[PDB]
PDB file of C-alpha atoms and ligand atoms in Angstrom:
ATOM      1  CA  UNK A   1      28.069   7.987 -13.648  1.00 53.33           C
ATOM      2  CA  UNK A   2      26.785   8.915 -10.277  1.00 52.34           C
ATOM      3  CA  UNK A   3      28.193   6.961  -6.895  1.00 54.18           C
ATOM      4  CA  UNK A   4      26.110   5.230  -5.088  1.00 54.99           C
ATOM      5  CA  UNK A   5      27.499   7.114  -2.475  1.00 55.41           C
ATOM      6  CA  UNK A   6      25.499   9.805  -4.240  1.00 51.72           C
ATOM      7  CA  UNK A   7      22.666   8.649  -4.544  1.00 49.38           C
ATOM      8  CA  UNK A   8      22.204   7.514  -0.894  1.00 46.13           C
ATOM      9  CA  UNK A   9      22.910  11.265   0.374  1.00 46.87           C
ATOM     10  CA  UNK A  10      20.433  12.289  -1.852  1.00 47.98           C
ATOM     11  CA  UNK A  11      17.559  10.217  -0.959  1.00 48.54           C
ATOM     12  CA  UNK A  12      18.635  10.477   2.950  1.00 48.88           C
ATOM     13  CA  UNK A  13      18.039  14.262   2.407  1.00 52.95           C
ATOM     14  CA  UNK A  14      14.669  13.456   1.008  1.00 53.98           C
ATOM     15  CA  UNK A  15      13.491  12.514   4.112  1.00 48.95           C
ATOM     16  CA  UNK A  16      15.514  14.313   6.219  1.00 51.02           C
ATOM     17  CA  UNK A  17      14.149  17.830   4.556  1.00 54.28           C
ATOM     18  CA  UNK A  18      10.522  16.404   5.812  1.00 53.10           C
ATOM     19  CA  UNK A  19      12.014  16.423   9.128  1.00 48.35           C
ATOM     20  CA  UNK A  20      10.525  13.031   9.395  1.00 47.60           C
ATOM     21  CA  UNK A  21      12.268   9.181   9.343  1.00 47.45           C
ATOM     22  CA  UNK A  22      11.961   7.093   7.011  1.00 44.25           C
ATOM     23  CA  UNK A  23      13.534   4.358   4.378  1.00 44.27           C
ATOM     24  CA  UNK A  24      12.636   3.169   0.931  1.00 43.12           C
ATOM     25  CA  UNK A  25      12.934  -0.399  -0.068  1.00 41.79           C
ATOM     26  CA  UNK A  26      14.013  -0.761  -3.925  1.00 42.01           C
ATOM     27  CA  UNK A  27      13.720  -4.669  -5.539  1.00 48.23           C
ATOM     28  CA  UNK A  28      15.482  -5.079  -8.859  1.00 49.14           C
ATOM     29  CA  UNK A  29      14.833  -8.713  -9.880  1.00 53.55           C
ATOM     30  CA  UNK A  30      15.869 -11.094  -6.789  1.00 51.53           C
ATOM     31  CA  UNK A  31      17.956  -7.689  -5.128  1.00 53.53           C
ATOM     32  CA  UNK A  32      16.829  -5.318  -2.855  1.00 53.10           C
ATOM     33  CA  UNK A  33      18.226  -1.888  -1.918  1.00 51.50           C
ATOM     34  CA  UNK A  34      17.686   0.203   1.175  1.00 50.74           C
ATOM     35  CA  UNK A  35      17.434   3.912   1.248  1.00 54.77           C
ATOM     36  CA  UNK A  36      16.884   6.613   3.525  1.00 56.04           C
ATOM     37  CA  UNK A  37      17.182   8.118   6.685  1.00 57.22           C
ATOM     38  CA  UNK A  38      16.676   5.778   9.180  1.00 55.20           C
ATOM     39  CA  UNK A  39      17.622   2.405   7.415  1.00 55.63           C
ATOM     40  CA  UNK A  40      16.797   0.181  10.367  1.00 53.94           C
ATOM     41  CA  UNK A  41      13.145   0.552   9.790  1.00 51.97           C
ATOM     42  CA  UNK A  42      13.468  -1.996   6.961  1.00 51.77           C
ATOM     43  CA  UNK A  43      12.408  -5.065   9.210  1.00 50.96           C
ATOM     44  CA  UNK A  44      10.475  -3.139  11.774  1.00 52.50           C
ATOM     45  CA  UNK A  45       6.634  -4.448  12.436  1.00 54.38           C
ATOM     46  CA  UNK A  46       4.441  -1.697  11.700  1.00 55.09           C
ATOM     47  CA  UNK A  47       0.255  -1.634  10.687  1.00 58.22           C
ATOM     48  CA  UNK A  48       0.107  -1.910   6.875  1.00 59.21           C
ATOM     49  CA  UNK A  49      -2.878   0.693   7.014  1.00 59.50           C
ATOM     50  CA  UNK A  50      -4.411   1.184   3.818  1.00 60.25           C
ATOM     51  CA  UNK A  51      -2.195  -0.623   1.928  1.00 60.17           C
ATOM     52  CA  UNK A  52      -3.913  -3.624   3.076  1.00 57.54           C
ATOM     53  CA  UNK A  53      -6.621  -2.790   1.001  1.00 59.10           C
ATOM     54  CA  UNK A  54      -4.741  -4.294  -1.925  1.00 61.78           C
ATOM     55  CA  UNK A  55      -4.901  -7.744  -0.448  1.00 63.66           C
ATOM     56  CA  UNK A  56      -8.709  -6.868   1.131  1.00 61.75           C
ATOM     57  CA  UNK A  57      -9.503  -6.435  -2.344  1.00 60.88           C
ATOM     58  CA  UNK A  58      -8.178  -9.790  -3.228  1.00 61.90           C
ATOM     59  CA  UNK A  59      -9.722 -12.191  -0.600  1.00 63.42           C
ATOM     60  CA  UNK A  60     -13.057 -10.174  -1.487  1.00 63.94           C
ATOM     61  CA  UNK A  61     -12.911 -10.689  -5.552  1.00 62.37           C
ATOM     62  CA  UNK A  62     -11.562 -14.166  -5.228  1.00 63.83           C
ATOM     63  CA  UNK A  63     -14.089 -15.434  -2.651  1.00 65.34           C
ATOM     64  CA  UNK A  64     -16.945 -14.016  -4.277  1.00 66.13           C
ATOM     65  CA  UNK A  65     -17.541 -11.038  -1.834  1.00 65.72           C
ATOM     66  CA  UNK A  66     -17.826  -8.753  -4.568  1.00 64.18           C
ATOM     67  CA  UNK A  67     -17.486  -7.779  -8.259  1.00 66.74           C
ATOM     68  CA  UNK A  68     -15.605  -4.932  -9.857  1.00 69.05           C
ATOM     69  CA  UNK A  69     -18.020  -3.273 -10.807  1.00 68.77           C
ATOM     70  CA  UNK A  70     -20.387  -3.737  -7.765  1.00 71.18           C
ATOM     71  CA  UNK A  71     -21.150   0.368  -6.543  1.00 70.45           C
ATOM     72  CA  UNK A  72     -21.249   0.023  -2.296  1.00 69.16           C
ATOM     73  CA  UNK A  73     -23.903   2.378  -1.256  1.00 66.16           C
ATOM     74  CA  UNK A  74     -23.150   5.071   1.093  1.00 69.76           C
ATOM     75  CA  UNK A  75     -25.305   5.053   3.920  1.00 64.83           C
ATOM     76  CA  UNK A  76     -26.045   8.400   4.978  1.00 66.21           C
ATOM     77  CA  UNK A  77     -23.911   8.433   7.763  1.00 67.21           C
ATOM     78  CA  UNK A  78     -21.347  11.468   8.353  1.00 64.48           C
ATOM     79  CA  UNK A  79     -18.107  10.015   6.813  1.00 63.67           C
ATOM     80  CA  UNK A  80     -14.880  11.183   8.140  1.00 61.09           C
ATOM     81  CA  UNK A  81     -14.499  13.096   4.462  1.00 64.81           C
ATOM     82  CA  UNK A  82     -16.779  14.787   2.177  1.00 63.49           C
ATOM     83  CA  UNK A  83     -15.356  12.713  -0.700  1.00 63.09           C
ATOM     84  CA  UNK A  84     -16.367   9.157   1.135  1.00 62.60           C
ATOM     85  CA  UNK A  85     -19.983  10.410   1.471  1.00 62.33           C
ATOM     86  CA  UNK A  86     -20.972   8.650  -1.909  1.00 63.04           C
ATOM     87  CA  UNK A  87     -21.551   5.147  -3.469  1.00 62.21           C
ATOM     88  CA  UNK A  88     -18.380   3.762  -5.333  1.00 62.85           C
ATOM     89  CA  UNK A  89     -16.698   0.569  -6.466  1.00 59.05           C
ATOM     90  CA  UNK A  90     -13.913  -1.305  -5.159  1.00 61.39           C
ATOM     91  CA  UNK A  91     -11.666   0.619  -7.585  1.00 59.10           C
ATOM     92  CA  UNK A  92     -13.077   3.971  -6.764  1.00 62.39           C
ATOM     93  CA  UNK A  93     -12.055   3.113  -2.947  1.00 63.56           C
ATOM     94  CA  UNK A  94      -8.859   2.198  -3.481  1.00 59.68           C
ATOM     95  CA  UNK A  95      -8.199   5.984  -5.028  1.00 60.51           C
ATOM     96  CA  UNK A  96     -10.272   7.665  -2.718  1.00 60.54           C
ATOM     97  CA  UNK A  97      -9.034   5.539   0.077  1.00 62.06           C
ATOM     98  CA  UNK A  98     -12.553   5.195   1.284  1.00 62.57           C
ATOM     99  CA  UNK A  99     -11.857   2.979   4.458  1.00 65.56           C
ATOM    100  CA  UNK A 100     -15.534   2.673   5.239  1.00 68.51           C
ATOM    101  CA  UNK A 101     -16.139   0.427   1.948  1.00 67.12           C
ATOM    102  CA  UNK A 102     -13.314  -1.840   2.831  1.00 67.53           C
ATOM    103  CA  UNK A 103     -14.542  -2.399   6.413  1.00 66.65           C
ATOM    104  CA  UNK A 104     -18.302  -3.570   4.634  1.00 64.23           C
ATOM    105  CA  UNK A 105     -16.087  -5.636   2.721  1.00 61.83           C
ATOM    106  CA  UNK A 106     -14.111  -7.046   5.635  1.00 58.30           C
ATOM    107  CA  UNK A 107     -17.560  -7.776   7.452  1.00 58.50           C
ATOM    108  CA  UNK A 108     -18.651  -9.978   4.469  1.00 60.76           C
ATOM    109  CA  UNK A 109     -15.520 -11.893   3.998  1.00 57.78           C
ATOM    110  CA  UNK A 110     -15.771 -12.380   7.969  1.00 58.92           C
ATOM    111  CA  UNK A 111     -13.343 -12.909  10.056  1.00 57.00           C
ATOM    112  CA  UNK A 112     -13.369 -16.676   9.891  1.00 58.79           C
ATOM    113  CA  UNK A 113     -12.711 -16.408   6.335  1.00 59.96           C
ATOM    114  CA  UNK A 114     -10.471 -13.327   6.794  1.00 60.52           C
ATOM    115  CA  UNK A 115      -7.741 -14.810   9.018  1.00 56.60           C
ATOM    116  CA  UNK A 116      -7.821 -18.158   6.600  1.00 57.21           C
ATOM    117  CA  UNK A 117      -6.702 -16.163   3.615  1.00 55.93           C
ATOM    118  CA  UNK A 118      -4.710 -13.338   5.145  1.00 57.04           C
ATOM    119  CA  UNK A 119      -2.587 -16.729   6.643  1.00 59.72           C
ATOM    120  CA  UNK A 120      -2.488 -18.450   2.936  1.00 59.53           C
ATOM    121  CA  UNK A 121      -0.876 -15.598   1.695  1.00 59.89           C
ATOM    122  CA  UNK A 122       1.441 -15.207   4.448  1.00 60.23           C
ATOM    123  CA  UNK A 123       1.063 -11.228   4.798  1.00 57.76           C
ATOM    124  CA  UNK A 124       3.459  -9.601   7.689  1.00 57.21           C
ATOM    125  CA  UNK A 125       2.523 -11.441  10.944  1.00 55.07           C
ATOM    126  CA  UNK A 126      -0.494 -13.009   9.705  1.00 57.36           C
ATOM    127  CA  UNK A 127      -2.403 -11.976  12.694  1.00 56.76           C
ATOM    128  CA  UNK A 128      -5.391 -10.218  12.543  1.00 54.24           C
ATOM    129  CA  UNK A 129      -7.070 -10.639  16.204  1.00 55.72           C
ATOM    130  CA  UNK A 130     -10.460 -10.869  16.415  1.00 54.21           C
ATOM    131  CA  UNK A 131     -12.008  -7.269  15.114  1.00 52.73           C
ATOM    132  CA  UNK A 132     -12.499  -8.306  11.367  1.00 54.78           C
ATOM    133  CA  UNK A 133     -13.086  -4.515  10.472  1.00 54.17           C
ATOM    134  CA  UNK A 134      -9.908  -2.758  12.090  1.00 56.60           C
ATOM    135  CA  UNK A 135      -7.097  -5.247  12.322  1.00 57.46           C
ATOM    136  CA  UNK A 136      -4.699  -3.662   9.632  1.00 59.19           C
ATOM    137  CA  UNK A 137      -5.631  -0.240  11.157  1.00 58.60           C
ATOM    138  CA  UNK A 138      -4.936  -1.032  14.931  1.00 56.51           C
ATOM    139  CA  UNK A 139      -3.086  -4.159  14.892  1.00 61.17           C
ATOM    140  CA  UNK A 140      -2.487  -7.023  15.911  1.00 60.52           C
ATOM    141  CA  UNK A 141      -1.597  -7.126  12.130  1.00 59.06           C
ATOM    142  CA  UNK A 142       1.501  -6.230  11.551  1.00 55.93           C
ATOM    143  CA  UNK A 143       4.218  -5.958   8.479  1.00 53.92           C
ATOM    144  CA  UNK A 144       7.754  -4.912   7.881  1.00 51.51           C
ATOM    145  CA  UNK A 145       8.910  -2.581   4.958  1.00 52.42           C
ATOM    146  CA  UNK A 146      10.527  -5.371   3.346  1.00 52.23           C
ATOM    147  CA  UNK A 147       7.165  -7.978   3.588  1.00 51.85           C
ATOM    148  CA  UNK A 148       5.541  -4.807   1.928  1.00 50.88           C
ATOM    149  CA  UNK A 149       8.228  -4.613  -1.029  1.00 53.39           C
ATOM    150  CA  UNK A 150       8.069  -8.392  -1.950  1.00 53.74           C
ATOM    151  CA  UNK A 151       4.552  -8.281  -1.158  1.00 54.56           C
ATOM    152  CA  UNK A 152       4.136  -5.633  -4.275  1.00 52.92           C
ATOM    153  CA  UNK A 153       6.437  -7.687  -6.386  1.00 56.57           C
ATOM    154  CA  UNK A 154       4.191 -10.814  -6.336  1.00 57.18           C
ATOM    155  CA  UNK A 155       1.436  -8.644  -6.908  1.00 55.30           C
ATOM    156  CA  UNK A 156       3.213  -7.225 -10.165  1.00 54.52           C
ATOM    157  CA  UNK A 157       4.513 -10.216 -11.159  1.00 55.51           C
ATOM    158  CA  UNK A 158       1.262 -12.384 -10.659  1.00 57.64           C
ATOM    159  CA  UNK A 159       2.780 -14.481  -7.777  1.00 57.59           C
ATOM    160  CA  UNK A 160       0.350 -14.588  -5.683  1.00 59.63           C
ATOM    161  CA  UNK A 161      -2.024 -17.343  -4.710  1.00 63.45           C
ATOM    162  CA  UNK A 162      -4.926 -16.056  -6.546  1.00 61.96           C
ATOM    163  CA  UNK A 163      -6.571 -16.425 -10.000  1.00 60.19           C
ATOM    164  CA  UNK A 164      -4.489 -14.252 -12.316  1.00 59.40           C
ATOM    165  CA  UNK A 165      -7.459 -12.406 -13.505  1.00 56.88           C
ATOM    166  CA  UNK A 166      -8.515 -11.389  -9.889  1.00 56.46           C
ATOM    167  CA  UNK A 167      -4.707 -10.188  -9.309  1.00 59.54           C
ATOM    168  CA  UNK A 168      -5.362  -8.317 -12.759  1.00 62.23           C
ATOM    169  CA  UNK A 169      -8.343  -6.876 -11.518  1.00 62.20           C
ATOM    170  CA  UNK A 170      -6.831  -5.550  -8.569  1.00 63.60           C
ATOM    171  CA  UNK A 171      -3.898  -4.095 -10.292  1.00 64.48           C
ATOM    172  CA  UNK A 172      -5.711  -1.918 -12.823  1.00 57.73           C
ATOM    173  CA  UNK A 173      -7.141  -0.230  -9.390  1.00 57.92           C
ATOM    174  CA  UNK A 174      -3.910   1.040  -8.368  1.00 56.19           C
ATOM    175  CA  UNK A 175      -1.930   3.068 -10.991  1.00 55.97           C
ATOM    176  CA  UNK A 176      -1.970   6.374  -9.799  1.00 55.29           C
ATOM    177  CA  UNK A 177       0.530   7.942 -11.908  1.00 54.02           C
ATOM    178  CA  UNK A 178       2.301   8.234 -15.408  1.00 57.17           C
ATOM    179  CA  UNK A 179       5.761   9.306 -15.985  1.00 57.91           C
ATOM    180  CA  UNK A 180       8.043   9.566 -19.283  1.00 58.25           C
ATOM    181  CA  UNK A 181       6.481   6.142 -20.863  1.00 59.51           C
ATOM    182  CA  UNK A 182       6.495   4.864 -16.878  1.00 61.93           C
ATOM    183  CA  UNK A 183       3.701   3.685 -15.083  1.00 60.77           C
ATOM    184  CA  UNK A 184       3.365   3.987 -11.371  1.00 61.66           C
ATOM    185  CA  UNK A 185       0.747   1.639  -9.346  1.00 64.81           C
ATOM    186  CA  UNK A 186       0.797   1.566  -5.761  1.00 65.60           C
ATOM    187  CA  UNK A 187      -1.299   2.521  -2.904  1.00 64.00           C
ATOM    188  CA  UNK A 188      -0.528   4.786  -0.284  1.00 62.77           C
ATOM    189  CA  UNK A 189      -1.294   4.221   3.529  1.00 62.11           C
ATOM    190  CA  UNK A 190      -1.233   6.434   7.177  1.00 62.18           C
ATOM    191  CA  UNK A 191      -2.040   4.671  10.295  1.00 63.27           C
ATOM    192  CA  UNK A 192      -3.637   7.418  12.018  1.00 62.47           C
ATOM    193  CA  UNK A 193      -4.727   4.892  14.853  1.00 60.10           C
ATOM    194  CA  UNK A 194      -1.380   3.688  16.355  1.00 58.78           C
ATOM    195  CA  UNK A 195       1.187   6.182  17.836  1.00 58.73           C
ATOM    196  CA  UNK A 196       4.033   7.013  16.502  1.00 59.93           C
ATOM    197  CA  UNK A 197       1.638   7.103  13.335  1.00 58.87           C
ATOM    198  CA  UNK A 198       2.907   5.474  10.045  1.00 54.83           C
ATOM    199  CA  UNK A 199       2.898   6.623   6.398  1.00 54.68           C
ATOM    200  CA  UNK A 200       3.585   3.812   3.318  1.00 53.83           C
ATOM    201  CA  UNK A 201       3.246   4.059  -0.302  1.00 59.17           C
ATOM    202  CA  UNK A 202       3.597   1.022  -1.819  1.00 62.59           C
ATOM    203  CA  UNK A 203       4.033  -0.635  -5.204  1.00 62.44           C
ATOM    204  CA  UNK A 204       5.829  -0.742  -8.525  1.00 61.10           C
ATOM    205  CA  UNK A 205       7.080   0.847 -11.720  1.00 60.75           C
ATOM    206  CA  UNK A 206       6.089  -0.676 -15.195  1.00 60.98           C
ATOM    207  CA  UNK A 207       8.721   1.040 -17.306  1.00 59.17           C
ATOM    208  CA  UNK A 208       8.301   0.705 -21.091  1.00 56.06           C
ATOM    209  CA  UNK A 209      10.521  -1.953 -21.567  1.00 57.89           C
ATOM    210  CA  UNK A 210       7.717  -3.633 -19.326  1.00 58.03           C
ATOM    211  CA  UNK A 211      10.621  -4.209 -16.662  1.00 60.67           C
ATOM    212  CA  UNK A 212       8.945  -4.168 -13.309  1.00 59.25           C
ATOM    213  CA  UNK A 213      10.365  -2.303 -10.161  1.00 58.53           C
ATOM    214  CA  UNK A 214       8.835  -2.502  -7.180  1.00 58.01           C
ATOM    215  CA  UNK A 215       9.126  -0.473  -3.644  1.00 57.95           C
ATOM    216  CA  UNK A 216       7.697   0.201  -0.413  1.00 56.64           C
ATOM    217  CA  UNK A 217       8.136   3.758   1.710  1.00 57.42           C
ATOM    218  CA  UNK A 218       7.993   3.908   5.053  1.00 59.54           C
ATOM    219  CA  UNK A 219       7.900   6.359   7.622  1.00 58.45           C
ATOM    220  CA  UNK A 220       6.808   8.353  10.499  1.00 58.04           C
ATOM    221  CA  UNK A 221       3.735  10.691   9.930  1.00 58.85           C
ATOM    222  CA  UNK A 222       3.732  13.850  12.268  1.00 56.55           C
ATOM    223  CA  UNK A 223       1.200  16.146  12.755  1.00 57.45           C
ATOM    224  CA  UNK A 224       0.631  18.607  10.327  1.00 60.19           C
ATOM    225  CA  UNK A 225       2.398  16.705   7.559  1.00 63.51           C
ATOM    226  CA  UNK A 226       1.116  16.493   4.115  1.00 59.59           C
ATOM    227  CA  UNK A 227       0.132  12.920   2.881  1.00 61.38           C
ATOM    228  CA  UNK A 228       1.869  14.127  -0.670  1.00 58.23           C
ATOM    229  CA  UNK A 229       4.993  14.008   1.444  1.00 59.27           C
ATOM    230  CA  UNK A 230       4.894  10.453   1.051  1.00 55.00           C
ATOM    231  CA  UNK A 231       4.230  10.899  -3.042  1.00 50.90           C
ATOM    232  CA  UNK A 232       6.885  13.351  -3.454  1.00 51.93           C
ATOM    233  CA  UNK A 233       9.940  11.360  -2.044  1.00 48.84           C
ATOM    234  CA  UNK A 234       8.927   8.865  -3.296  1.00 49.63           C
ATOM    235  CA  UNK A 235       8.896  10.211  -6.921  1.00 51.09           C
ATOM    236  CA  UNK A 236      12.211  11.899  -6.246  1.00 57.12           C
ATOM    237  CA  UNK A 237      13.835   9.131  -4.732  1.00 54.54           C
ATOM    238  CA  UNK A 238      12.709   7.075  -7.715  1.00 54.91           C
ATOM    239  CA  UNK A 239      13.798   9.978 -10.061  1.00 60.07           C
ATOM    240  CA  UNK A 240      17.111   9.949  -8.638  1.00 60.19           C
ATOM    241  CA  UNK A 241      17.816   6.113  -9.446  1.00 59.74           C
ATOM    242  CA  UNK A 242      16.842   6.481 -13.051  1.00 61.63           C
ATOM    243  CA  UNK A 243      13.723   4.427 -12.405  1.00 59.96           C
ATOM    244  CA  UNK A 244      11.159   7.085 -13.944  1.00 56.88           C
TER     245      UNK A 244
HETATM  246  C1  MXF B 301      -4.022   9.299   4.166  1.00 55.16           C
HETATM  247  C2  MXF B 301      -4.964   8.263   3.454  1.00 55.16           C
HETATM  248  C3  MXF B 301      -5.345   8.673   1.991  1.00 55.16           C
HETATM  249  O1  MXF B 301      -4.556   9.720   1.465  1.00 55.16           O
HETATM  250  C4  MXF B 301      -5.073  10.984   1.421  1.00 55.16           C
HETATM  251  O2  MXF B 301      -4.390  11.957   1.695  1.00 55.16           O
HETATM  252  N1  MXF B 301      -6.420  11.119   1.076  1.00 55.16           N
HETATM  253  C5  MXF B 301      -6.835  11.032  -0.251  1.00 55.16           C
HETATM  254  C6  MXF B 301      -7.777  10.801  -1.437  1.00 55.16           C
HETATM  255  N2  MXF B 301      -7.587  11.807  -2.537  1.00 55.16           N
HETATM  256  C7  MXF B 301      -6.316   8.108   4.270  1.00 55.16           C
HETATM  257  N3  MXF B 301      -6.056   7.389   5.537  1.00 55.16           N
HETATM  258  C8  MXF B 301      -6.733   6.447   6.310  1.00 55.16           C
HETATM  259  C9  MXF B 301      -6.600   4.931   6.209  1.00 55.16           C
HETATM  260  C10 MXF B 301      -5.706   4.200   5.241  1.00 55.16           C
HETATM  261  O3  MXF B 301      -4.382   4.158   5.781  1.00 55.16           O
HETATM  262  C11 MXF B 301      -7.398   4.307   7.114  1.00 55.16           C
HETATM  263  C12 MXF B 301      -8.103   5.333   7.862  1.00 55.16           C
HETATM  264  C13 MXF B 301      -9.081   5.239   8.942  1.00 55.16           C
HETATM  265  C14 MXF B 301      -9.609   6.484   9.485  1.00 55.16           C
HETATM  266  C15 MXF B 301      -9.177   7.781   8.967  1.00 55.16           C
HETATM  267  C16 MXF B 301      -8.212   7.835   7.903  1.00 55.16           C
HETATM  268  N4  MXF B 301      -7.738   6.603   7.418  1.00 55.16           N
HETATM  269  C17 MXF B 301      -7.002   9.435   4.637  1.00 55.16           C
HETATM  270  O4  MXF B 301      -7.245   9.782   5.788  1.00 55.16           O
HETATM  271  O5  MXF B 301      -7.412  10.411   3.573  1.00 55.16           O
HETATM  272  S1  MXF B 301      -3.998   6.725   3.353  1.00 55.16           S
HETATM  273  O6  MXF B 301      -2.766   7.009   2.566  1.00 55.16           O
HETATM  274  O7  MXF B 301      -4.895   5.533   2.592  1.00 55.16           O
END
């Protein structure tokens, strides 16, 4: 079959045909494997960005902040998209990416609450200042590719330290894509705030064996780059490992 040799060259040129950097943590049970083209960015601190969403969404459904089918009423106010200007559930926001419901959401968790439950589940640094509505988009929180990776396999595998229904809630908001009897959740992410910028897409395979693989991507977002850049090497790179 194919080297591994192979397969490395391959991915590398993934990201090196974006003319960006970048690596792509793979977890196969208890083992994970690095790929890419700049490997040490595997336990670099970097924002999490959207994909902190996927935890936001926990503390809120857990502590009562919100239900899943609760619709969050837009206010009126010019969004920075079209597609945010419009009332939507938890779910719907985690598609859409609507930032501005997940800050409402922050505000009613509060920070108080916030920084108690980000630091029970031990997510990156655990840090998240004292701006309740912009600490995974500015810092001081922080995460490494890696933290992300294990991070989605506790999700998939019901690990964390929430009710399994709430992680089960959450999960059913994130698959984004089907694939030859292979489901893909995960949630993608660009910290547009912090410079160099970063772009993630995070999350897991269910293949139909019901075998779990999770991953996290990482890399630098330059201007004028397509946020599908971060879906299509990631599909490839996936692709090329015979995960999908
Ligand atoms: C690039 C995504 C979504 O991805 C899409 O390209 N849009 C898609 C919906 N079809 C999204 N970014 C994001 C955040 C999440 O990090 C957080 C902010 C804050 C301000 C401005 C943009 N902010 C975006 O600006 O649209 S990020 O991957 O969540």
């Amino acid at each position: 079959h194919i080297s591994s040799q192979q397969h490395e060259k391959a991915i590398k040129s993934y990201f090196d045909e974006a003319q960006t950097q970048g690596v792509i943590i793979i977890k196969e049970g208890k083992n994970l494997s690095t790929y890419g083209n700049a490997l040490a960015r595997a336990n670099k601190e970097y924002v999490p960005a959207s994909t902190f969403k996927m935890l936001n969404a926990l503390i809120g459904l857990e502590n009562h902040k919100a239900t899943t089918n609760e619709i969050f009423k837009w206010d009126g106010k010019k969004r920075t998209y079209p597609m945010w200007e419009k009332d939507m559930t938890l779910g719907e926001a985690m598609a859409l990416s609507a930032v501005p419901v997940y800050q409402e959401l922050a505000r009613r968790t509060g920070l108080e609450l916030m920084q108690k439950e980000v630091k029970r589940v031990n997510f990156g640094n655990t840090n998240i200042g004292t701006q309740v509505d912009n600490f995974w988009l500015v810092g001081p929180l922080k995460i490494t590719p890696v933290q992300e990776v294990n991070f989605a396999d506790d999700l998939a595998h019901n690990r964390l330290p929430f009710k399994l229904e709430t992680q089960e809630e959450v999960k059913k908001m994130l698959l984004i894509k089907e694939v030859n009897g292979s489901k893909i959740y995960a949630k993608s992410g660009w910290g547009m705030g912090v410079t160099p910028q970063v772009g993630w897409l995070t999350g897991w395979v269910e293949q139909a064996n019901g075998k779990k693989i999770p991953f996290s991507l990482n890399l630098e977002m330059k201007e004028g780059m397509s946020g599908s850049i971060r879906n299509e090497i990631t599909y490839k790179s996936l692709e090329n490992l015979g995960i999908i």
